[PDB]
Amino acid sequence: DGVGSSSGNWHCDSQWLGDRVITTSTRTWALPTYNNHLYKQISNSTSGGS
Amino acid sequence: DGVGSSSGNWHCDSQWLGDRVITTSTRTWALPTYNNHLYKQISNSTSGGS
Amino acid sequence: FNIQVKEVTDNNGVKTIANNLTSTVQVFTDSDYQLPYVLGSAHEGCLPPFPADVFMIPQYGYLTLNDGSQAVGRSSFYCLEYFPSQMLRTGNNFQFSYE
Amino acid sequence: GMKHPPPQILIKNTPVPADPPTAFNKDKLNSFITQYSTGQVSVEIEWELQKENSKRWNPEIQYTSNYYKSNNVEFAVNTEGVYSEPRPIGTRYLTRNL
Amino acid sequence: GMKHPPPQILIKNTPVPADPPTAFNKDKLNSFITQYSTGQVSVEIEWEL
């Protein structure tokens, strides 16, 4: 549990046991900073009328 | 088990115990990023015909 | 073992390499021979005979059924991502045994 | 449809202020270190199946790939490395009496 | 010759995305931090004579 330690593995498989199926998916994501760290009021008005 | 700790030793020797031989080899490798993180379809067509 | 993930930066031709401690490497073994077996085709990129040599790991690629440069309905596509694999940052070691 | 479906999972990078002025100011900070994060996600779902028990004599309709030769494999990657789903696929292939 | 020879051992550097746009886009990311890894390998085989 440290900077230099993985905190999870890529587990990704589907196994069928008869009456049940177990799907497991792993994806790698990216998260930007949205809205300049702001909550902004929006409307069809701030969207250029409609 | 941390950034500043070796996670294995260079063990490399062959020992003979009579009817058995134990060979142990250690090499140092390098791994580039292949295919720009892509799976690409290939054929003798994408290879310039043949 | 002794994994080191390095990040290369190239600004104005000036290349520089730094450690990326948080980066990981994925490793897994085709224990059930579900992937096209590439070994035993006398391919280059084995461990060098001389212990001192530092080698580059060969890229994995494979071939299915073909009709000229086209693929028939049988042809199989495999995604290695669709396999469970261990993930390791520097300071993590992988190993397995085989009979 | 569910009254209590899988809950929403919200994520956000915690704001990291740039160097603030050395003289107090009541205004909220608007100067931040530009950041972004990355990692892995794992979603494991367990599905329950209701297997077919038909007494139909003749073979049923089945979803199949087309054997006829083609440039690319259906539901595979391009030569550019672009995965594509060639068509929509329903679930209604097997038959059952009313 | 073996029906079950030594299994294939596949390795890969996990992709590390560069700075993504601050506005959502459905397209898969194609801008990555250029990386490579290095380390040690050990192969120990027991042979019968």
Short mmCIF file of C-alpha atoms in Angstrom, two decimals:
data_model
loop_
_atom_site.label_atom_id
_atom_site.label_comp_id
_atom_site.label_asym_id
_atom_site.label_seq_id
_atom_site.Cartn_x
_atom_site.Cartn_y
_atom_site.Cartn_z
CA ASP A 1 0.00 0.00 0.00
CA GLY A 2 2.52 2.59 -1.16
CA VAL A 3 3.36 4.90 -4.06
CA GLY A 4 5.34 1.97 -5.54
CA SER A 5 2.59 -0.66 -5.10
CA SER A 6 -0.22 -1.57 -7.50
CA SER A 7 -3.65 -1.17 -5.84
CA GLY A 8 -5.53 -3.61 -8.12
CA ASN A 9 -5.14 -6.06 -11.00
CA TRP A 10 -6.64 -6.27 -14.44
CA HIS A 11 -9.27 -8.88 -13.97
CA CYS A 12 -11.35 -9.26 -17.08
CA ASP A 13 -13.15 -12.46 -17.97
CA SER A 14 -16.56 -14.03 -18.32
CA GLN A 15 -17.25 -17.41 -16.77
CA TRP A 16 -20.35 -19.54 -17.18
CA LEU A 17 -21.35 -21.85 -14.37
CA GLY A 18 -24.58 -23.16 -15.92
CA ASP A 19 -27.53 -20.93 -14.91
CA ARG A 20 -25.32 -17.88 -14.22
CA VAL A 21 -22.82 -15.76 -16.14
CA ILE A 22 -20.20 -13.53 -14.52
CA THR A 23 -18.91 -10.68 -16.69
CA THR A 24 -15.93 -8.66 -15.41
CA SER A 25 -14.56 -5.67 -17.32
CA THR A 26 -11.55 -3.43 -16.74
CA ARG A 27 -10.97 -0.16 -18.59
CA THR A 28 -8.39 2.60 -18.11
CA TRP A 29 -9.89 6.08 -17.73
CA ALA A 30 -8.79 9.73 -17.71
CA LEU A 31 -10.40 12.49 -15.65
CA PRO A 32 -9.83 16.18 -16.57
CA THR A 33 -10.79 19.11 -14.34
CA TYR A 34 -14.32 20.15 -15.32
CA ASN A 35 -15.77 23.67 -15.14
CA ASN A 36 -12.59 25.25 -13.67
CA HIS A 37 -13.69 23.77 -10.28
CA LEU A 38 -17.00 25.70 -10.57
CA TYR A 39 -20.71 24.98 -10.35
CA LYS A 40 -22.32 26.94 -13.19
CA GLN A 41 -25.98 27.74 -13.83
CA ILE A 42 -27.07 26.71 -17.32
CA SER A 43 -30.23 27.24 -19.35
CA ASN A 44 -31.36 27.43 -22.99
CA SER A 45 -30.53 31.15 -22.41
CA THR A 46 -26.81 30.54 -21.64
CA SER A 47 -26.95 28.03 -24.55
CA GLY A 48 -27.83 30.79 -27.09
CA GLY A 49 -31.66 30.86 -26.82
CA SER A 50 -33.97 28.25 -28.44
CA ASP B 1 8.35 -3.97 -0.68
CA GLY B 2 8.77 -0.31 -1.60
CA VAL B 3 10.07 1.99 -4.34
CA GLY B 4 13.46 1.81 -2.57
CA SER B 5 13.55 -2.01 -2.21
CA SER B 6 14.86 -4.60 -4.67
CA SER B 7 12.15 -7.13 -5.61
CA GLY B 8 14.52 -9.96 -6.64
CA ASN B 9 18.18 -10.98 -6.87
CA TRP B 10 20.39 -12.04 -9.71
CA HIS B 11 20.48 -15.75 -9.28
CA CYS B 12 22.33 -17.39 -12.12
CA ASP B 13 24.07 -20.72 -11.78
CA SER B 14 23.95 -24.33 -12.86
CA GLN B 15 24.31 -27.09 -10.29
CA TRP B 16 24.65 -30.80 -10.94
CA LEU B 17 23.36 -33.22 -8.34
CA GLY B 18 24.10 -36.44 -10.24
CA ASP B 19 21.08 -37.41 -12.39
CA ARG B 20 19.72 -33.84 -12.56
CA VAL B 21 20.96 -30.44 -13.71
CA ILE B 22 19.47 -27.12 -12.61
CA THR B 23 20.08 -24.19 -14.95
CA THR B 24 19.09 -20.70 -13.75
CA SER B 25 19.46 -17.63 -15.98
CA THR B 26 18.90 -13.93 -15.34
CA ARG B 27 18.78 -11.31 -18.08
CA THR B 28 17.87 -7.61 -18.03
CA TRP B 29 15.19 -6.63 -20.56
CA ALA B 30 13.63 -3.51 -22.07
CA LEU B 31 10.00 -3.18 -23.17
CA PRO B 32 8.95 -0.37 -25.57
CA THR B 33 5.34 0.55 -26.32
CA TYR B 34 4.28 -1.48 -29.36
CA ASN B 35 1.75 -0.42 -32.01
CA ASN B 36 0.91 2.94 -30.34
CA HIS B 37 -1.30 0.93 -27.90
CA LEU B 38 -3.28 -0.43 -30.89
CA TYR B 39 -4.40 -3.78 -32.25
CA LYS B 40 -3.84 -3.62 -36.02
CA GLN B 41 -5.08 -5.92 -38.77
CA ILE B 42 -2.24 -7.16 -40.97
CA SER B 43 -2.09 -9.15 -44.20
CA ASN B 44 0.20 -9.67 -47.21
CA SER B 45 -1.93 -6.74 -48.54
CA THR B 46 -0.87 -4.28 -45.78
CA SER B 47 2.65 -5.75 -46.28
CA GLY B 48 2.81 -4.53 -49.93
CA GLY B 49 1.20 -7.49 -51.77
CA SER B 50 3.00 -10.80 -52.50
CA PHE C 1 11.36 -8.27 -10.84
CA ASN C 2 13.03 -4.87 -10.37
CA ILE C 3 10.51 -3.30 -12.78
CA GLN C 4 11.29 0.29 -13.73
CA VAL C 5 8.76 2.28 -15.75
CA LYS C 6 10.40 5.28 -17.37
CA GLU C 7 8.76 8.27 -19.02
CA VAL C 8 10.49 10.01 -21.93
CA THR C 9 10.03 13.74 -22.57
CA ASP C 10 11.08 15.34 -25.86
CA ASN C 11 10.88 19.15 -25.93
CA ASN C 12 12.72 20.87 -28.81
CA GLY C 13 14.71 17.70 -29.67
CA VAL C 14 16.04 17.78 -26.04
CA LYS C 15 15.12 14.27 -24.89
CA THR C 16 15.11 13.36 -21.18
CA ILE C 17 14.14 10.19 -19.28
CA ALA C 18 12.59 10.16 -15.79
CA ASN C 19 11.01 7.47 -13.59
CA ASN C 20 7.21 7.25 -13.51
CA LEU C 21 6.80 5.52 -10.15
CA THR C 22 2.99 5.23 -10.34
CA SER C 23 3.00 3.55 -13.79
CA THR C 24 2.35 -0.19 -14.07
CA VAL C 25 3.22 -3.10 -16.36
CA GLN C 26 0.75 -5.91 -17.18
CA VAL C 27 1.79 -9.55 -17.28
CA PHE C 28 -0.16 -12.79 -17.67
CA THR C 29 0.42 -16.39 -18.74
CA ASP C 30 -1.54 -18.22 -21.44
CA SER C 31 -2.03 -21.11 -18.98
CA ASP C 32 -4.93 -22.55 -21.02
CA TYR C 33 -3.32 -22.12 -24.48
CA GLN C 34 -6.25 -19.93 -25.62
CA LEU C 35 -3.92 -17.69 -27.64
CA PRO C 36 -2.16 -18.72 -30.90
CA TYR C 37 1.11 -20.31 -29.74
CA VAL C 38 3.99 -18.27 -31.25
CA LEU C 39 6.89 -19.95 -29.42
CA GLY C 40 8.50 -22.95 -31.16
CA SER C 41 8.58 -21.32 -34.61
CA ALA C 42 12.34 -20.63 -34.23
CA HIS C 43 11.66 -16.90 -33.68
CA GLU C 44 14.30 -14.32 -32.80
CA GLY C 45 14.09 -12.34 -29.52
CA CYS C 46 14.87 -15.07 -26.98
CA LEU C 47 17.08 -14.40 -23.94
CA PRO C 48 20.58 -13.62 -25.30
CA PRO C 49 23.08 -16.53 -24.79
CA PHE C 50 25.49 -14.17 -23.00
CA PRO C 51 24.25 -13.16 -19.49
CA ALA C 52 25.68 -9.61 -19.81
CA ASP C 53 23.60 -8.71 -22.89
CA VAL C 54 20.51 -6.53 -22.38
CA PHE C 55 17.75 -7.55 -24.80
CA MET C 56 14.55 -6.04 -26.17
CA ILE C 57 11.30 -7.99 -25.70
CA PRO C 58 9.76 -9.12 -29.06
CA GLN C 59 6.29 -7.89 -30.07
CA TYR C 60 3.40 -10.37 -30.12
CA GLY C 61 1.42 -10.90 -33.33
CA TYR C 62 -0.62 -13.76 -34.81
CA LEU C 63 -2.25 -15.26 -37.90
CA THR C 64 -5.66 -16.91 -38.44
CA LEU C 65 -7.44 -18.25 -41.54
CA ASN C 66 -6.91 -16.30 -44.76
CA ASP C 67 -8.14 -16.41 -48.34
CA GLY C 68 -5.45 -14.36 -50.08
CA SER C 69 -5.23 -11.11 -48.08
CA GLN C 70 -8.83 -11.54 -46.84
CA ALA C 71 -10.25 -13.15 -43.75
CA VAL C 72 -12.96 -15.78 -43.87
CA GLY C 73 -15.79 -16.17 -41.34
CA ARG C 74 -13.81 -18.67 -39.31
CA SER C 75 -10.91 -16.29 -38.76
CA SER C 76 -10.50 -15.49 -35.07
CA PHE C 77 -9.67 -12.17 -33.44
CA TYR C 78 -8.10 -12.23 -29.97
CA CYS C 79 -7.87 -9.31 -27.55
CA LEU C 80 -5.24 -9.89 -24.84
CA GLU C 81 -6.99 -7.25 -22.72
CA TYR C 82 -9.82 -9.82 -22.43
CA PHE C 83 -7.51 -11.86 -20.18
CA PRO C 84 -7.02 -11.34 -16.40
CA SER C 85 -3.44 -10.20 -15.84
CA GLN C 86 -1.37 -9.02 -12.91
CA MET C 87 -0.49 -5.35 -12.71
CA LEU C 88 2.75 -4.25 -11.12
CA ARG C 89 4.47 -0.97 -10.31
CA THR C 90 8.14 -0.87 -9.46
CA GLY C 91 8.56 -2.87 -6.27
CA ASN C 92 6.22 -5.65 -7.36
CA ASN C 93 7.41 -9.06 -8.52
CA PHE C 94 5.76 -11.65 -10.77
CA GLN C 95 6.53 -15.40 -10.84
CA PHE C 96 5.03 -18.79 -11.68
CA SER C 97 6.00 -22.47 -11.89
CA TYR C 98 5.47 -25.04 -14.66
CA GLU C 99 5.64 -28.84 -14.83
CA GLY D 1 -36.62 -0.81 -14.71
CA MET D 2 -35.70 -0.45 -11.03
CA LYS D 3 -36.78 1.86 -8.18
CA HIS D 4 -33.21 1.45 -6.87
CA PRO D 5 -30.94 0.91 -9.95
CA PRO D 6 -27.07 0.80 -9.74
CA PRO D 7 -26.18 4.04 -7.85
CA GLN D 8 -24.43 6.92 -9.63
CA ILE D 9 -20.64 6.96 -9.07
CA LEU D 10 -19.22 10.49 -9.00
CA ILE D 11 -15.51 11.28 -9.20
CA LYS D 12 -13.55 14.57 -9.20
CA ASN D 13 -9.96 15.79 -8.91
CA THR D 14 -9.56 17.67 -5.63
CA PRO D 15 -8.58 21.30 -6.41
CA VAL D 16 -4.93 22.14 -5.69
CA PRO D 17 -4.48 25.93 -5.19
CA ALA D 18 -1.55 27.68 -6.87
CA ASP D 19 0.67 29.99 -4.75
CA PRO D 20 -1.69 32.34 -2.83
CA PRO D 21 -0.82 36.04 -2.14
CA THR D 22 1.23 36.69 1.03
CA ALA D 23 -1.47 39.17 2.17
CA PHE D 24 -4.89 37.91 3.31
CA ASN D 25 -7.82 38.17 0.89
CA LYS D 26 -11.43 37.11 1.59
CA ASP D 27 -12.14 36.19 -2.06
CA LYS D 28 -12.26 32.48 -2.91
CA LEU D 29 -9.12 31.22 -4.68
CA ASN D 30 -9.41 31.07 -8.48
CA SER D 31 -5.77 30.16 -9.28
CA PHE D 32 -5.26 26.39 -9.37
CA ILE D 33 -2.55 23.93 -10.41
CA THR D 34 -3.82 22.35 -13.65
CA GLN D 35 -4.28 18.62 -13.03
CA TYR D 36 -5.92 15.48 -14.35
CA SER D 37 -6.08 11.89 -13.07
CA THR D 38 -6.05 8.42 -14.63
CA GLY D 39 -6.49 4.82 -13.44
CA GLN D 40 -8.42 1.57 -13.86
CA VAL D 41 -12.07 0.64 -13.38
CA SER D 42 -13.50 -2.84 -12.76
CA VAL D 43 -17.16 -3.75 -13.15
CA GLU D 44 -18.21 -7.30 -12.29
CA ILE D 45 -21.85 -8.24 -12.86
CA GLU D 46 -23.46 -11.60 -12.11
CA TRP D 47 -26.28 -12.45 -14.53
CA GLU D 48 -28.92 -15.13 -13.97
CA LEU D 49 -29.89 -17.25 -16.97
CA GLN D 50 -33.18 -18.87 -17.90
CA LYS D 51 -32.18 -21.76 -20.18
CA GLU D 52 -34.32 -22.97 -23.07
CA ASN D 53 -36.26 -26.22 -22.73
CA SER D 54 -38.07 -26.39 -26.09
CA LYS D 55 -39.56 -29.56 -27.62
CA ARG D 56 -39.30 -28.14 -31.17
CA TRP D 57 -38.10 -30.75 -33.67
CA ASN D 58 -36.60 -28.54 -36.41
CA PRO D 59 -33.46 -26.37 -35.81
CA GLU D 60 -33.86 -22.80 -34.54
CA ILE D 61 -32.62 -19.44 -35.87
CA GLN D 62 -29.16 -18.61 -34.51
CA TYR D 63 -27.02 -15.47 -34.62
CA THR D 64 -24.00 -16.27 -36.81
CA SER D 65 -21.11 -14.50 -38.53
CA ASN D 66 -20.89 -14.59 -42.31
CA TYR D 67 -18.52 -17.16 -43.71
CA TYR D 68 -18.02 -15.30 -46.98
CA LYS D 69 -14.55 -13.80 -47.24
CA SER D 70 -14.06 -10.11 -46.45
CA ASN D 71 -11.43 -7.40 -45.87
CA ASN D 72 -11.98 -7.14 -42.09
CA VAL D 73 -13.39 -9.43 -39.39
CA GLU D 74 -16.83 -8.48 -38.01
CA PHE D 75 -16.51 -7.11 -34.44
CA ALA D 76 -12.71 -6.89 -34.75
CA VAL D 77 -10.15 -4.10 -35.15
CA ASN D 78 -9.40 -2.08 -38.27
CA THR D 79 -5.97 -1.84 -39.97
CA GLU D 80 -5.93 1.57 -38.21
CA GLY D 81 -6.69 -0.13 -34.86
CA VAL D 82 -10.34 1.07 -34.83
CA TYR D 83 -12.77 -1.37 -33.21
CA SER D 84 -16.25 -1.31 -34.79
CA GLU D 85 -19.63 -2.94 -34.21
CA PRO D 86 -20.92 -3.66 -37.76
CA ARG D 87 -24.58 -4.11 -36.71
CA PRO D 88 -27.10 -4.06 -33.79
CA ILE D 89 -27.70 -7.46 -32.17
CA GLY D 90 -30.99 -8.24 -30.40
CA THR D 91 -31.70 -11.26 -28.16
CA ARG D 92 -34.72 -12.84 -29.87
CA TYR D 93 -33.46 -15.82 -31.85
CA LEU D 94 -34.77 -18.83 -29.91
CA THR D 95 -38.52 -19.42 -30.20
CA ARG D 96 -41.24 -20.32 -27.69
CA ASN D 97 -44.99 -20.98 -27.85
CA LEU D 98 -47.53 -18.37 -26.73
CA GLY E 1 6.98 -31.95 -28.48
CA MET E 2 4.29 -31.27 -25.87
CA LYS E 3 0.48 -30.87 -25.93
CA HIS E 4 0.98 -28.43 -23.02
CA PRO E 5 4.44 -26.78 -23.50
CA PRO E 6 5.72 -23.86 -21.30
CA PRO E 7 2.87 -21.28 -21.50
CA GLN E 8 3.32 -17.99 -23.37
CA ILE E 9 4.23 -15.06 -21.09
CA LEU E 10 2.81 -11.76 -22.33
CA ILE E 11 3.86 -8.36 -20.99
CA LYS E 12 2.81 -4.78 -21.87
CA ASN E 13 3.23 -1.25 -20.53
CA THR E 14 -0.14 0.01 -19.31
CA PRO E 15 -1.12 3.09 -21.39
CA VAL E 16 -0.82 6.40 -19.52
CA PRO E 17 -3.06 9.09 -21.14
CA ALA E 18 -1.65 12.58 -21.70
CA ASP E 19 -3.71 15.60 -20.53
CA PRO E 20 -7.28 15.09 -21.87
CA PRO E 21 -9.46 18.03 -23.10
CA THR E 22 -11.51 19.81 -20.40
CA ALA E 23 -14.67 19.17 -22.48
CA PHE E 24 -16.10 15.65 -22.80
CA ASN E 25 -15.43 13.70 -26.00
CA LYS E 26 -16.70 10.18 -26.81
CA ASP E 27 -13.66 9.31 -28.97
CA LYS E 28 -11.07 6.96 -27.45
CA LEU E 29 -7.92 8.74 -26.25
CA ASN E 30 -5.03 8.69 -28.73
CA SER E 31 -2.63 11.00 -26.83
CA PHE E 32 -0.37 9.06 -24.47
CA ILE E 33 2.70 9.70 -22.33
CA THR E 34 5.58 7.96 -24.14
CA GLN E 35 6.92 5.23 -21.85
CA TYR E 36 9.02 2.08 -21.74
CA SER E 37 9.89 -0.37 -18.95
CA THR E 38 12.95 -2.40 -17.94
CA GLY E 39 13.79 -5.08 -15.35
CA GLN E 40 15.14 -8.57 -14.75
CA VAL E 41 13.97 -12.03 -15.79
CA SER E 42 14.82 -15.36 -14.14
CA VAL E 43 14.30 -18.75 -15.76
CA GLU E 44 15.16 -21.84 -13.72
CA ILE E 45 14.79 -25.22 -15.42
CA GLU E 46 15.43 -28.62 -13.86
CA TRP E 47 16.73 -31.18 -16.37
CA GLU E 48 16.78 -34.94 -15.84
CA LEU E 49 19.87 -36.82 -17.03
#
